[PDB]
Amino acid sequence: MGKYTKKFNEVRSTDRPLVGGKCASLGEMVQAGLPVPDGFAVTIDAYEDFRDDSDLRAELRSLVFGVDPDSSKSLQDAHDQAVALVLGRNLPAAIEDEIREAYLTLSRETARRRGTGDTDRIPVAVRSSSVDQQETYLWVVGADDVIAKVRECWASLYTPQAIAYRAGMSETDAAEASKISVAVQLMADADVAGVMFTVSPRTGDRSVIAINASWGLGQSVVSGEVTPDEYWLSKIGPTLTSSRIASKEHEYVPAPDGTGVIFREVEQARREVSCLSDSELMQLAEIGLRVEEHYGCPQDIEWALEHDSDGTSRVMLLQSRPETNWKKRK
């Protein structure tokens, strides 16, 4: 059937009926040639056919429609019971196996691409996706945890707040507002990571690109636990105009078992070397231009770079927002 998961490369914008907003979002981006972490959507029908396999639907509705919406003890109660069922009832085999298979596919493809161990335990993020509250689990490892966290996502539909808000609506609306999708995406396993601005934070010059980069996970650069290398390009060209290479003393990497990060020392030989090649700056610079023309304002981008087993450098776009000062001023 194939009804329950869809790879990101195949999700379009016009798939909002089946994957929701966040996921059709990520779909248009890949489509616009913006390289977001690879993964798949768990489609709205995974949750839908779950609640329809037994009386589960009637009972959750009953619970939501039952509540004293001005009593907190009423919301707690309904929340508790609702969640127990959402994590508890049997998941239909067709749903479970497809989610399992989609994850194994991602893990094997990735282990091939990264040229790392094919151990079916690739770390992923799992994040909820309303059809029109964000739940996020990071560093999820193995098919069992993916299934477990996908269910947690479905359960977050039944917070005190979320219940109270649907308890109001017409049955139609609550049914439509109970639809959910789930995104399963690679955690980065960055060789180099960092941030990029398509405007100078300092001057508000919108004709330059600033990249701050360090070894391993972007966390060391985002949290200021390392002194990054700094590069400046002009957009016209693009032309590299300036670099400043630091002693990069620490990095974060994935934990071996994939469940967290670990802080460690960058060994001598790598500390004072430039962590981005001239071709990689140009890759990054080009993605910044794409990303900024897509959104239509200057960006503050968080990126990662992986070197694939064959050798090609692959840039991942992890997050992106308007650059704050440009925005503050405006």
Numbering used by the authors: 1 to 132, 143 to 340
The authors write:
Catabolism in GD02 is initiated by a two-component kinase, HpeHI, which catalyzes the ATP-dependent phosphorylation of AV or HAP to 4-phospho-AV or 4-phosphoacetophenone (PAP), respectively. The structural data indicate that HpeHI is a two-component homolog of RPH, a single component enzyme involved in antibiotic resistance.
The ATP-binding site is located at the interface between the N- and C-terminal α/β lobes. The motif comprises β-strands 3 and 4 and their joining loop (V124-V150) located in the N-terminal α/β lobe. Notably, residues 133 to 142 comprising the conserved loop could not be modeled in our HpeI structure and are presumably disordered. Another notable feature of the HpeI structure is that it is in a more open conformation than many characterized grasp domains. The ATP grasp domains from RPH and PPDK structures were shown to undergo a hinge-like ATP-dependent conformational change between the two α/β lobes to enclose ATP. More particularly, the structural data indicate that HpeI corresponds to the ATP-grasp domain of RPH while HpeH harbors the swivel and RIF-binding domains of RPH.
